[PDB]
Amino acid sequence: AYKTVLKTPSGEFTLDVPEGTTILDAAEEAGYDLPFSCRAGACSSCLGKVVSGSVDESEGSFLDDGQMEEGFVLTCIAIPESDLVIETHKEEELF
Numbered sequence: 001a002y003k004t005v006l007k008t009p010s011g012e013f014t015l016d017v018p019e020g021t022t023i024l025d026a027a028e029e030a031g032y033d034l035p036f037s038c039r040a041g042a043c044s045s046c047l048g049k050v051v052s053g054s055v056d057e058s059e060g061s062f063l064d065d066g067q068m069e070e071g072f073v074l075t076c077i078a079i080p081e082s083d084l085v086i087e088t089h090k091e092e093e094l095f
């Protein structure tokens with residue numbers, strides 16, 4: 001649904017993420033490969049960083065408030081509230 005740009009280590013990819021759809025799910029659907037392990041919001045495997053737009057990552061229990069203020073997001077659980085630009089594969093820098 002909302003136009004989402006994934007800036008991944010292999011390039012920028014635009015996809016349409018439907019409302020109520022997690023970023024991870026829509027990307028997989030599109031055929032993109034993004035990191036993940038628990039898929040429940042309790043690790044940092046699927047860590048990304050929101051560059052613009054907003055998401056609802058209310059389900060997550062891993063990031064502290066300062067991390068969220070910084071723009072860190074758990075892509076397996078985040079649902080877009082607008083058009084977004086997100087950096088993926090963020091654990092690979094800041095585990």
Ligand code: FES
Binds near residue numbers: 040
């Ligand atoms: S895969 Fe564990 S929080 Fe997203």
